[PDB]
Amino acid sequence: VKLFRASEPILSVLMWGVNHTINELSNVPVPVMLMPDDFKAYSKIKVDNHLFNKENLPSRFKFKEYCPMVFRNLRERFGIDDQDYQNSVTRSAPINRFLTTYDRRFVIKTVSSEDVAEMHNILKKYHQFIVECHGNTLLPQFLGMYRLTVDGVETYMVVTRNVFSHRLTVHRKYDLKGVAREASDKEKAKDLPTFKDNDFLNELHVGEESKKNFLEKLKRDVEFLAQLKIMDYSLLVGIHDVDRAEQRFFGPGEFDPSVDVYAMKSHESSPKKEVYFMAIIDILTPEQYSKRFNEFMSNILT
Amino acid sequence: KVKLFRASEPILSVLMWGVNHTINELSNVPVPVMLMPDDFKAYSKIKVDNHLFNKENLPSRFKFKEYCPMVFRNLRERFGIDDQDYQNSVTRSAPINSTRFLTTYDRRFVIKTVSSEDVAEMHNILKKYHQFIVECHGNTLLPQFLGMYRLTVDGVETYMVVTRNVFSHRLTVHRKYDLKGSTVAREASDKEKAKDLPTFKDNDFLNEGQKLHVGEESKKNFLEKLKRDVEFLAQLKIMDYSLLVGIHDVDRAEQEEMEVEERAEDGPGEFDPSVDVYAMKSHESSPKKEVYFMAIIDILTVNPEQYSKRFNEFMSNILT
Ligand SMILES: Nc1ncnc2c1ncn2[C@@H]1O[C@H](COP(=O)(O)OP(=O)(O)NP(=O)(O)O)[C@@H](O)[C@H]1O
Numbered sequence: 072v073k074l075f076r077a078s079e080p081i082l083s084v085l086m087w088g089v090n091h092t093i094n095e096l097s098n099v100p101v102p103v104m105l106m107p108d109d110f111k112a113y114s115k116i117k118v119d120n121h122l123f124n125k126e127n128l129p130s131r132f133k134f135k136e137y138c139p140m141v142f143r144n145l146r147e148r149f150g151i152d153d154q155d156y157q158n159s160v161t162r163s164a165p166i167n168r169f170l171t172t173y174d175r176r177f178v179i180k181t182v183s184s185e186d187v188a189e190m191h192n193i194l195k196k197y198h199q200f201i202v203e204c205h206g207n208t209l210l211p212q213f214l215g216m217y218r219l220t221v222d223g224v225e226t227y228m229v230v231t232r233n234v235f236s237h238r239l240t241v242h243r244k245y246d247l248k249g250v251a252r253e254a255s256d257k258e259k260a261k262d263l264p265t266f267k268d269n270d271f272l273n274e275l276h277v278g279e280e281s282k283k284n285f286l287e288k289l290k291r292d293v294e295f296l297a298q299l300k301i302m303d304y305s306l307l308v309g310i311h312d313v314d315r316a317e318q319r320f321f322g323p324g325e326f327d328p329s330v331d332v333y334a335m336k337s338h339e340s341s342p343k344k345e346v347y348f349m350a351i352i353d354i355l356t357p358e359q360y361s362k363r364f365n366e367f368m369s370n371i372l373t
Numbered sequence: 374k375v376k377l378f379r380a381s382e383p384i385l386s387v388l389m390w391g392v393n394h395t396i397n398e399l400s401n402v403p404v405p406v407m408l409m410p411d412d413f414k415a416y417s418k419i420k421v422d423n424h425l426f427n428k429e430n431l432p433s434r435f436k437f438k439e440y441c442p443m444v445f446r447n448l449r450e451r452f453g454i455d456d457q458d459y460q461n462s463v464t465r466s467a468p469i470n471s472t473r474f475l476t477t478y479d480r481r482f483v484i485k486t487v488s489s490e491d492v493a494e495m496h497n498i499l500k501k502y503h504q505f506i507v508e509c510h511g512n513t514l515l516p517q518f519l520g521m522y523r524l525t526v527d528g529v530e531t532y533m534v535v536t537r538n539v540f541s542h543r544l545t546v547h548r549k550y551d552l553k554g555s556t557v558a559r560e561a562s563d564k565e566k567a568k569d570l571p572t573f574k575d576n577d578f579l580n581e582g583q584k585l586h587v588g589e590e591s592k593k594n595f596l597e598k599l600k601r602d603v604e605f606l607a608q609l610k611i612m613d614y615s616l617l618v619g620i621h622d623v624d625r626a627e628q629e630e631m632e633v634e635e636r637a638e639d640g641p642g643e644f645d646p647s648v649d650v651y652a653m654k655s656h657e658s659s660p661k662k663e664v665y666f667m668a669i670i671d672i673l674t675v676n677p678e679q680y681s682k683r684f685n686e687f688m689s690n691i692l693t
Pocket residue numbers: 169178231232233234235244265307352
């Protein structure tokens with residue numbers, strides 16, 4: 072029995088909604104190819120309950136899903152099962168605009184109508200690239216996109232794969248832009264600092280073989296982004312120090328590569344034993360920035 | 374596994390979609406200790422406007438509304454009907470027709486199109502009808518109401534009520550009567566009489582000498598329901614409802630089926646009573662071995678009191 076209990080009503084609708092669309096999809100055959108109309112398509116449902124089912128949901132709400140077929144394809148191409156995706160959103164309320172699913176597998180980002188429009192502008196080209204690179208990318212993985220309507224207010228959301236491990240704690244964020252920007256004495260007053268380029272140089276050893284696959288990947292992504300006149304991303308980086316973690320059951324530095332899709336173990340010949348997470352984030356908003364950024368990352372490996 | 378909701382008309386698709394939708398929704402909703410007053414004023418409404426998506430069987434745009442869902446789920450429970458079952462009967466394959474007199478593909482349930490006025494009359498009587506199904510434990514010749522819906526397709530509204538079938542989902546009806554016990558000439562038409570399975574009326578039955586012989590403990594259970602049922606209806610300003618009577622001929626049912634097997638080369642007279650709920654066997658010492666099906670239908674200078682009494686006498690006499 073899926074109650075849709077959640078702190079905010081808007082969260083209840085997101086749960087209700089992901090549940091609804093995925094069940095509905097399980098009844099729509101998986102086609103032999105996507106079609107052009109699939110990229111212009113959506114699903115809209117308006118609910119009006121009167122004296123019924125009022126416990127966790129609002130009685131009146133709308134739920135809209137953009138290009139359901141495309142995103143179910145992307146999901147597949149990212150090795151994510153629909154039932155799993157559904158369980159991660161519905162089984163428990165997502166948690167703390169930036170959300171994670173209760174199990175930390177997926178990130179839910181609130182976005183503007185301009186973003187949704189930008190998404191539409193890039194989606195076919197972006198899909199074709201996921202095909203061509205067989206899902207092996209450092210680009211953000213777009214899992215679904217929705218418009219919720221609660222109390223006449225519209226809210227747009229994109230679901231992506233979390234960059235960080237869903238289990239392994241993180242101990243240092245780095246948002247790497249590639250001009251100077253640092254961390255705020257106000258932001259450094261928080262438990263998990265979001266440091267930038269300048270702070271990174273002021274303060275990663277994966278080997279020479281993973282670099283030969285990371286950079287292979289990263290450079291092709293950055294190319295594709297340029298040609299989309301997309302600029303202003305970051306590369307998000309995470310660090311998990313194993314030793315500190317220690318201070319039936321899993322173990323230290325133990326992770327599932329098919330789940331924590333961005334996770335990289337450290338070399339043997341390397342200072343502390345740690346697990347890194349790296350992927351490209353925030354792409355919804357060219358060549359200079361791609362050369363200037365691609366070079367910054369390459370200068371952070373050995 | 375995949376439910377296409379494929380059907381002869383878009384309206385039936387939407388019917389399938391909607392029964393599927395609501396039963397599924399309902400599965401996420403606990404089962405209450407009691408119903409509350411508002412449960413009887415309650416409804417669910419859904420509006421779908423898909424665009425370029427999922428258009429093979431459903432329309433892109435439709436509405437589905439279910440009346441007092443909690444109250445019908447409860448009716449279903451008291452009539453010994455699982456919601457998953459009910460749902461599979463409506464959604465596994467398209468219902469078939471006889472819009473706008475359908476049966477589920479498996480002949481368990483009947484879907485009747487009704488009027489707006491009918492839907493109103495259901496609301497009027499619903500609180501009373503429910504309480505009646507309570508004190509009578511589900512034992513009644515009255516219609517078993519399992520659901521009530523409004524469909525909107527092409528901006529047209531269609532009202533439908535689901536009942537349990539009076540007839541067997543398995544055994545074959547070879548003859549049927551619709552009886553009111555009226556004073557007026559009730560006979561089947563020239564057109565009716567030439568139909569495949571004509572719906573005969575009071576005077577046909579009478580001028581035909583048929584009695585039904587069910588034998589005592591059956592006759593008693595039946596007549597007791599009838600008295601209680603019709604007295605309930607008369608209480609609720611209800612008139613013009615009929616006793617629906619189907620006859621099944623076992624012998625003819627053993628030969629007809631023996632014709633399919635033969636041409637296909639190129640128990641008998643019994644039924645689960647928990648399923649065929651209005652069926653009674655013919656009396657041990659009767660001519661033909663027969664199964665009857667009898668229920669009241671159509672409840673949505675004569676007044677209701679007199680019609681209740683009258684109807685009851687005629688009915689109480691249709692069978693020895
Ligand atoms: N896939 C992901 N996995 C884990 N964390 C993520 C993921 N995507 C985004 N984030 C986080 O979500 C964040 C959004 O960044 P936002 O920093 O607050 O930038 P900002 O410009 O400084 N704030 P704003 O004023 O709203 O523009 C960062 O903390 C990211 O680490």
